[PDB]
Design a protein around this nucleic acid. Structure first.
Length: 65
DNA sequence: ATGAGACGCTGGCGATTAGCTAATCGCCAGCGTCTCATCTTTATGCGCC
């Protein structure tokens, strides 16, 4: 079962795509600005860590295969 | 009063492996008899409401 086909470059690649998308989506959804020259955040881009969702699947018998 | 979450060559070959109607034409077709009787029906020939 422990085939383990992943390569570290896919890890740093995931880090790359997340860092880029965060700053792409941060500017593509919020377009208007307020009266004090600050962008109006009609849509909030929320960054949830992997550890929380993993433990959420693990601590409530909602496992994933 | 820390220790899980992230899993391969396949497609494009050969080369097995397996299996099937169809289109063209030819051949070749159980048959032999008699008896006996039986009825019809036809060709021609003859008659007026």
């Amino acid at each position: 079962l422990d085939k383990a086909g992943f390569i570290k470059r896919q890890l740093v690649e995931t880090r790359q795509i997340t860092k880029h998308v965060a700053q792409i989506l941060d500017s593509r959804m919020n377009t208007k600005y307020d009266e004090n020259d600050k962008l109006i955040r009609e849509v909030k881009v929320i960054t949830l860590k992997s550890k929380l969702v993993s433990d959420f699947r693990k601590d409530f018998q909602f496992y994933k295969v």
